[PDB]
Amino acid sequence: MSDVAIVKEGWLHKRGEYIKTWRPRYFLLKNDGTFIGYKERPQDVDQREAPLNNFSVAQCQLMKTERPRPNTFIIRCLQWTTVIERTFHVETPEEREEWTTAIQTVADGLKKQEE
Ligand SMILES: O=P(O)(O)Oc1ccc(OP(=O)(O)O)c(OP(=O)(O)O)c1OP(=O)(O)O
Ligand code: NA
């Protein structure tokens, strides 16, 4: 049960892929590697069951950049059978570190869970 527990949550900007833009999103990282985003913080169970974005951070790559926006981090991960890169930015390097440290820790936990 605590496998589906929330490890970290908060606001961040998700980068456009083919369009230059930053979309505001509220993301929750769960202990089973699920990383889900919403346009606003989910108020209830129903709002939680309808995420706009949903990635798995198992075995991901975590990169940190300052261009074009400072405090940006990139995640290279597997969406089913396709490797994808998603880009996010937060307000401070302190929060970026909280996010990349939380993500890596979860990935390491899933691996060690192959126990
Ligand atoms: O695969 P995801 O990261 O879950 O979703 C994407 C992916 C690509 C999008 O196209 P783009 O507008 O960013 O070029 C894209 O933008 P779009 O579908 O909303 O036009 C995505 O949806 P979202 O960022 O608005 O939630
Ligand atoms: Na689009």
Side-chain angles (χ1 to χ4, degrees), residues 18-19 23:
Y18 282 104
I19 217 85
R23 296 182 181 103

Side-chain angles (χ1 to χ4, degrees), residues 44-75 77-79:
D44 56 41
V45 162
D46 290 19
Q47 286 174 50
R48 296 273 248 310
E49 277 151 36
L52 290 184
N53 311 108
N54 180 357
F55 313 112
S56 160
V57 300
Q59 299 180 316
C60 69
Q61 243 92 295
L62 258 32
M63 291 152 276
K64 290 198 265 287
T65 56
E66 310 298 336
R67 253 57 194 269
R69 277 307 202 94
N71 310 311
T72 296
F73 63 98
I74 303 170
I75 296 168
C77 50
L78 198 74
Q79 188 73 309

Side-chain angles (χ1 to χ4, degrees), residues 53-75 77-108:
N53 311 108
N54 180 357
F55 313 112
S56 160
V57 300
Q59 299 180 316
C60 69
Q61 243 92 295
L62 258 32
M63 291 152 276
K64 290 198 265 287
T65 56
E66 310 298 336
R67 253 57 194 269
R69 277 307 202 94
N71 310 311
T72 296
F73 63 98
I74 303 170
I75 296 168
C77 50
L78 198 74
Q79 188 73 309
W80 189 220
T81 64
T82 309
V83 185
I84 63 181
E85 296 224 309
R86 286 302 179 268
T87 291
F88 307 92
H89 103 256
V90 290
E91 301 300 313
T92 70
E94 289 70 55
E95 45 189 336
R96 171 170 69 180
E97 258 298 6
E98 297 170 28
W99 275 108
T100 60
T101 293
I103 294 165
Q104 189 61 70
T105 288
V106 161
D108 295 343

